[PDB]
Structure formats: structure tokens, C-alpha cells
Amino acid sequence: GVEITEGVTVTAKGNTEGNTADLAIDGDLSTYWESSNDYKWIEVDLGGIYELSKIEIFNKDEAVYKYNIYASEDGENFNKIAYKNNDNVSDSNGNMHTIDNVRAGKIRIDVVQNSNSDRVNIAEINVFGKNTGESLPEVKKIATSNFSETPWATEYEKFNSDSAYANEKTLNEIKNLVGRVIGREFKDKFIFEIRDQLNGNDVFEVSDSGDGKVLIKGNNGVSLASGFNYYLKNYCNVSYNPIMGSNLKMPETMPSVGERVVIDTPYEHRYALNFCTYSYTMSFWDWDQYEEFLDWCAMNGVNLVLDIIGQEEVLRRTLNEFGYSDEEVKEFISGPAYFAWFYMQNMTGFGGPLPNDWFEQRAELGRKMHDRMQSFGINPVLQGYSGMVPRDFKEKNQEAQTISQGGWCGFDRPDMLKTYVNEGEADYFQKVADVFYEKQKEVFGDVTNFYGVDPFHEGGNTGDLDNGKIYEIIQNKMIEHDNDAVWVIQNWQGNPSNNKLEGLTKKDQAMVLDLFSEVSPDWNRLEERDLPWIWNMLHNFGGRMGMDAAPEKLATEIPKALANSEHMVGIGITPEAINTNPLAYELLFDMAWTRDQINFRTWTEDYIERRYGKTNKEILEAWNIILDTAYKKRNDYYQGAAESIINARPGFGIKSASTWGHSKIVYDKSEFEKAIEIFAKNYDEFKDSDAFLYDFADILKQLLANSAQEYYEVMCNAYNNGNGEKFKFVSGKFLELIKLQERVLSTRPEFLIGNWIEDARTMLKDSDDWTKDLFEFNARALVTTWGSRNNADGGGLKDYSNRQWSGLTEDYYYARWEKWINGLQAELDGGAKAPNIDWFKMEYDWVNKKSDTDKLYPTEASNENLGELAKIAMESYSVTNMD
Ligand SMILES: CC(=O)N[C@H]1CN[C@H](CO)[C@@H](O)[C@@H]1O
Ligand SMILES: [Ca+2]
């Protein structure tokens, strides 16, 4: 006591009606607030700062409810003060939570589970507290800097206008890159020089200085970094991949170049990044990770990178001009794990709202990135505008004409402004596009000529509009704000259609990304229409893992397409995540520096030696087996690596874990296993190489995925055929195979869910518990259910981003299979019939757990011996000895 029984109010961000926020606080147990959407929390204001001692919660029924409670004394930071996570039913007595006399002027109650419904409810909440006679501070409004007012603008224009200073900046930066990549002690071993292009082509040179140093030339930063990487690869037996394993062991003394090389590239652009990459991989990156990525980019020849960092701030400024408060902008914008699908006009709100601190920090990080890109000569691809608006835009802007875009995977797509209207009508496309490009100037300045936007990505609705005319006006509006603008358009599954593309009246000022050139090339339509286009290796879908690459097509199809085209202005990568198969990415970027088809077999041989720091006859044969199996050329259509059955929702006739995925292994399994035998045989010799271990974990977990499939098939034959003792035995081995897999996965820092979760929880500083918990939800949801019930199930997104990850395998994948088995056993043993499992409910239970109250996943890899684990795999859990 005493009960705060006066002056209290409540807000909510959604409700079924008329089950509205205030009904949670009316002193009436028969009336209740109930959620309608994914905002499953209410905010209660206490009429002043109290020292809470108790909070009492009643629900509308007797279901099992789980919730987390947060308080704020400053009006900004909401910290967790209490929670219910036990499995007790609610009853007429309510739940009483003892508080330790915490100062609170506001409280948040986030009901994360209702065992009975997708909706949550609070019938009543009483708060018990001592009045401090204080009030909450006024919360400060979001205030960001204008680019021109910042130290960033001065630097940007100084570099821009001053050759000598720009050259000095660039050369000193490449020096810094050397120190970051191989070590500070090697910096002074290189001399870097700016030269001209080679017949209008980007170009580098590697030669001796005369006094034992390496002299590297290049027309810009990326050429210089590419020359630095050429030298390491071809003279030092060194290989750099900050994400997927390196060998950075330098020779004791710097090896001579001998004959000077001059290497040019026929491609104006080398492109990197899907919109999805920003979500599946980069959601929770800090500057350390970004800087490290741009170093790897520059070193692989990349000079065109997609960039959406801080675009939340650009849009906030845009929407503020058209009737939207900052709270409403925050409700529009998704959480930090979802920006790919938010900027692709597919989904809103989900994972949000972002903290207020978000905007300033992200604008700053993007400003930082453009400074570094400027030194290298990497063009960012900023945002274009195509008419995207919230669904309530007309409400707030009545003369506005809009087009409803329908659903995407159970999500409500944002609206789209009519790209043109009739005479006599207000043209809001022109109004919002004018503000949008203007505001993107104010945040970042004139940093780029390349702008990316993609109306009607994976659905939508063109309404009454002419398809060509839509693309004409989008481009003409873009060129109006930058006369040198190039519209970067994705080419995904035959869209945009030809007649949309024919509406582009300035062909040289668009550039189409052929997204999936290595499985499903679709550039001939673009080439015929004289559109500048880029050949891209997509490769990776959703971050889903497995041994999968197309190195032969990369080594042949790229130069072939150059020879057979006039408008191929580049090559690139469009992966949905960068987490898998480094060979694939190194070869693609290596193909920029050649006009001829190469030998993918001898390129691998060379590759593996510099990646491991050494090679032998046996390692080579193991890799040839891989080239002959998992990496063997194929001519069918498929999206990513063949999927592991371990990662699939349990059932009969499973042919995938994700909706558009595939689990059919197209190579001989016993033949692939030979690679693992050879790796285990050579483990002791090669365990000094971290990239060897990484590659060994990759093939071994592939082996167990492969054999898991066979054991799965045998065990549900056993169920179907009535036995019995058989099913139990085979299902026993299946679960044990997963426990061995889990140990294989504990070995790599990159396979740890704890790194993923912690990165999310700590990506900002000064964060409250509310924000950390919410960013953890984003991290957990993405790799599992993706959205909520209607996105996971009806929307088809269940386990789209399934990861063969430690912790996730123990507590999610293994748990599902164990239950299903447990399960069919109770049936087969004279019980049951086995009930229908509501899988989403089980998956979403894990999604909503918090690291600081439930279980904290490790950020430290284990010392398990992959050679030993491999022996156990071959002996006990293989196809070869399967029986
Ligand atoms: C849910 C998801 O990630 N969907 C992606 C499917 N593949 C397309 C091509 O990369 C993407 O545009 C979608 O966002
Ligand atoms: Ca009530």
C-alpha cells in the first residue's frame, strides 16, 4: 500500500473494440483491454512519481499468461521491475508482484503470452506506491543535426574540392586498412600511389620499390586495396575474410613481387548487398563490424554498395511535413531486424517502435560510413522515392490520392501515392518526393548519384495507372533532384515487366540489378532494351546454411556474358545474408579482373592453400570431392543451400524447412562423406588454421544434416509400418545425431545464437531494458517464426531464416523433434492418437524469452575437437555405415 487510486491514466497502441486501454484501469473486473495487433503492451501514467511496492494484475479469464513489467522515473528509460514467466493459471485472485520500492511515474506492462489466444488482455491493474510529491520531467523531442552544420560536411567538401588533401586522406586510409587487416607492424612495408585509369578502366599495379618494400598503385582507394589484396593472395599465401575465416599469417620477411603486374577491370561497377542483408546479417552491426566489411569490400574490388543506414531519420523528417508526429513515424517504421522489408514496401510497424535515441545515432553512423566510402571511392546507393506512405496518409492529407497495396506474407503493405493524378487534383507524389529528396540531402548531403527504390516488389497493386508512365515519372522526379542520378532497380522474378522498363526515357540513367544470375539469369530482356545492368550472384537465401556454391558458372558465365553484351556495366553480389560459403564470394569478385573464362578447379586449388596457409595432396582431393558434390554445377532452379531436416517443423513428407526452400540433396551422400574422412585424417596438421576449422565445421554439419534426412525417412516408415521398437530406436539415434550436431555447432563463434542476441541487446548504449528486450525479440523472431501467427503460418514465413546455430538447435529445433517423437511413441505404444501440435505457439514461446530472466546464451565457443566429432559421425551417424 497505499493503492494509487486517483490521477492514473493509460494508453495503448492497439485494441479490439470496444476493449480499450482505459478498461484496464476502471476498477471493474468484467471490463478489459485486449490487444488487436503485435503491440501487446499498455502504458500507465500514475499522476506523479511514486515509490512502487506492489503491482496487482487481473486477466479476463483463467488462461496462463506471461508478462514483463517496466517502470520509468525520467520519462525516457523504462526498466524491468517485475515479470511473470511461470505457467500458473490466472484466477479471481489476481497476480501480486512485490516491487522493491522503485521510483516510477510511468509503468509498461507487456503481455507476451496468452495460452488461450493470440490476443492478450488485462482486466485490471492496481498499483501500490508511496507518493514522492514529484512529477515526471518533460521528455525532450527528437532533435538531429543537419549535415551542413556538422564536422562531417566540412571534411566531405574539403576532400571533394582539394586534390592533394583527398589523395593524402585516401593514401593514409589504405595504410590504416593494411594495419587493421594484417597488423600495424606491416604498414610501413608498402608504398601507395594514385595513378590514372587504364583506358578508362579501374586498375592496380604491384611491383618492388627497390629497397625491399611493396609498391602498390591504383586509380582510387578500392584499386589500391585490391592491389594490396592481390599481393597477399599471390605472394604471401594470405587470405582475408573477416566474416567467413581468414589466414593472415605473414611470411617472416616480405616476399618480392619480381615482374611488375598491371591488372585492370572492364567493369565500371562491382556491387554488393541485397536489402535483406541489412536484416539477416547487419541488423545489429556496430561501426567495428562495418569498417571491417568496407575493408573487405575495397580489397575485393567493390565500388558500389547499397546503403540504408539512418534512412529512418530521412523519413521522419519527410513525414513530419505531412501530418505525422514522431510517435506516429515510430509506429510506421519497423524494428531494427526488419528494414529490408520496410524499405521494400512490404511491411510496417513490426518489431517497433524504435527508441528515440535511434535517429541521431543512425544518421551519425551513415555519415561516418560515407566519409570512409569517400576515401575508398565506394559509391553508396541511397534511397529513391516511389510513393510509399502510411495507410492513414489521406486521413492526414485529404486531397492525397492513394493506392492500397494489399498484403505481403500476412503483413499490411504501406499505401502508394498515385504517381500521377488528373488535372484539378493535388499531386502528392510530387509533394512528398520533393520533400523526401530534400530531407535526404539535409541528413547526408550530396554523397552519391545512385538511388535505389523498387515499387511493386513481390506484389502490390498498380491500380488504374499505366505501368510505363509510373516508371517515367519516378525517374524524372529523381533526375530533377540530381541531374546525374542513376536509378538502381532490382530485377526479381521477371519484375519490373518490360513495359514498366520501357517507360524509362533516360536509359543510361537507370541500372538494373539482375538479382539471381547464377541460377536464373534474366538480363537478356534488359540487354535488348539497352538498359545498363549488373550480373549478380545471389547465392544465399535467408541466411540458411549448407554447402552450396556455383563456382563453375561464376568462372564461365561471367566472361561469357561480357563477351555477348554491350550494356553489362558490372558484376555483383545480392545475398540475403553474408554467412556462408566464402569460396562463392571470393570467386565472384575475382571474376571482375578478367575478360576470359578461368579454370574453377585450379582456382580452388590455389584458393584453399592461401585460406589454410598450406595444402597437401589429401586436402586437395577432399576439395575436389566437394567440387564434385556440394559445389558441382547444376541446371535446376533452387533457392539457397539444401535445407536441413533438423531445422524443419516436424511432420510427414517434409521436403523443406522454409516455404520456398528445398531439402533434396543432389549429390551422392557417401561420396561427400569422404571429404570429412580426409579432413579428420588431416585435422591435427591443419588445426592451426582457423579457416580450416571453419570449413571443417561446415562440411561436418553438412554430413550430419545429410544423414539426419535418411534417419528421418526410416523412422516415419517405422511409424507407418506399426513398429514400434523400431521407431523408438531410430528416433533415439535421430535425437542423438542432433546432440552431436549441437557440439559441432558449439565450435564456431559465428554459430552462436548468444552473439546474435547480445549484439542486438547492446547495439545502442544508454538503452533501457525495454529497448534491449524489444531488440532481443527482433533477433529471436527473425531466425524463427519471422512474424507472428499470420506471418509465420498463413504468410508462409515460418523458419525462412533457419540457422544451424548453437543454442537455437538445443532449445528450439531439437525440442520440436523430441516433442513430435514423444509423441508418435505414445501412439505406437497403445495410447494417443498423437494430437495436432500448434507449432507456432511453441516457437513464439521461445521468441519472447529474455536473456536477463530466462536463459543467457554463451558468446564463447567451445573447445570440442572436430576431428574427434567427425570420427563419431562416421562410426555412428553416417550414411556409409548406416546399415
Ligand atoms: C522473407 C524474405 O526474406 N523474402 C525475400 C525472398 N527473396 C527475394 C530476393 O532476394 C527478396 O526480395 C525477399 O525479401
Ligand atoms: Ca476493467
PDB file of N, CA and C and ligand atoms in Angstrom, residues 21-33 122-125, ligand 2:
ATOM      1  N   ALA A  21      -7.877   0.674 -23.924  1.00  0.00           N
ATOM      2  CA  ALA A  21      -6.859   0.872 -22.867  1.00  0.00           C
ATOM      3  C   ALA A  21      -7.399   1.188 -21.456  1.00  0.00           C
ATOM      4  N   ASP A  22      -8.241   2.220 -21.365  1.00  0.00           N
ATOM      5  CA  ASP A  22      -8.893   2.647 -20.111  1.00  0.00           C
ATOM      6  C   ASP A  22      -9.663   1.554 -19.360  1.00  0.00           C
ATOM      7  N   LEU A  23     -10.077   0.507 -20.069  1.00  0.00           N
ATOM      8  CA  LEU A  23     -10.792  -0.602 -19.449  1.00  0.00           C
ATOM      9  C   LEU A  23      -9.879  -1.482 -18.583  1.00  0.00           C
ATOM     10  N   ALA A  24      -8.569  -1.298 -18.714  1.00  0.00           N
ATOM     11  CA  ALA A  24      -7.605  -1.992 -17.855  1.00  0.00           C
ATOM     12  C   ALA A  24      -7.465  -1.316 -16.489  1.00  0.00           C
ATOM     13  N   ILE A  25      -8.071  -0.138 -16.340  1.00  0.00           N
ATOM     14  CA  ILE A  25      -7.921   0.674 -15.128  1.00  0.00           C
ATOM     15  C   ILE A  25      -9.245   1.301 -14.604  1.00  0.00           C
ATOM     16  N   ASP A  26     -10.387   0.680 -14.888  1.00  0.00           N
ATOM     17  CA  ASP A  26     -11.683   1.253 -14.475  1.00  0.00           C
ATOM     18  C   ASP A  26     -12.240   0.712 -13.143  1.00  0.00           C
ATOM     19  N   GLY A  27     -11.429  -0.054 -12.411  1.00  0.00           N
ATOM     20  CA  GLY A  27     -11.866  -0.687 -11.158  1.00  0.00           C
ATOM     21  C   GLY A  27     -12.872  -1.809 -11.352  1.00  0.00           C
ATOM     22  N   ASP A  28     -12.979  -2.313 -12.581  1.00  0.00           N
ATOM     23  CA  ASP A  28     -14.033  -3.238 -12.969  1.00  0.00           C
ATOM     24  C   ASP A  28     -13.418  -4.489 -13.583  1.00  0.00           C
ATOM     25  N   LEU A  29     -13.581  -5.617 -12.898  1.00  0.00           N
ATOM     26  CA  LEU A  29     -13.013  -6.896 -13.330  1.00  0.00           C
ATOM     27  C   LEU A  29     -13.704  -7.518 -14.541  1.00  0.00           C
ATOM     28  N   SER A  30     -14.859  -6.974 -14.917  1.00  0.00           N
ATOM     29  CA  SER A  30     -15.645  -7.535 -16.015  1.00  0.00           C
ATOM     30  C   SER A  30     -15.310  -6.863 -17.343  1.00  0.00           C
ATOM     31  N   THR A  31     -14.663  -5.701 -17.277  1.00  0.00           N
ATOM     32  CA  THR A  31     -14.212  -4.994 -18.469  1.00  0.00           C
ATOM     33  C   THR A  31     -12.702  -5.147 -18.596  1.00  0.00           C
ATOM     34  N   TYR A  32     -12.202  -5.193 -19.830  1.00  0.00           N
ATOM     35  CA  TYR A  32     -10.770  -5.408 -20.061  1.00  0.00           C
ATOM     36  C   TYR A  32     -10.233  -4.729 -21.328  1.00  0.00           C
ATOM     37  N   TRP A  33      -8.963  -4.324 -21.296  1.00  0.00           N
ATOM     38  CA  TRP A  33      -8.225  -4.036 -22.528  1.00  0.00           C
ATOM     39  C   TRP A  33      -7.853  -5.374 -23.186  1.00  0.00           C
ATOM     40  N   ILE A 122      -5.686  -7.374 -20.223  1.00  0.00           N
ATOM     41  CA  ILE A 122      -5.605  -7.056 -18.800  1.00  0.00           C
ATOM     42  C   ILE A 122      -6.980  -6.540 -18.367  1.00  0.00           C
ATOM     43  N   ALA A 123      -7.621  -7.258 -17.446  1.00  0.00           N
ATOM     44  CA  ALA A 123      -8.931  -6.844 -16.922  1.00  0.00           C
ATOM     45  C   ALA A 123      -8.786  -5.696 -15.931  1.00  0.00           C
ATOM     46  N   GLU A 124      -7.830  -5.813 -15.016  1.00  0.00           N
ATOM     47  CA  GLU A 124      -7.500  -4.731 -14.096  1.00  0.00           C
ATOM     48  C   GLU A 124      -6.028  -4.774 -13.736  1.00  0.00           C
ATOM     49  N   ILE A 125      -5.474  -3.596 -13.472  1.00  0.00           N
ATOM     50  CA  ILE A 125      -4.166  -3.471 -12.850  1.00  0.00           C
ATOM     51  C   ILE A 125      -4.198  -2.390 -11.761  1.00  0.00           C
TER      52      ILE A 125
HETATM   53 CA    CA B   2     -11.529  -3.326 -16.204  1.00  0.00          CA
END
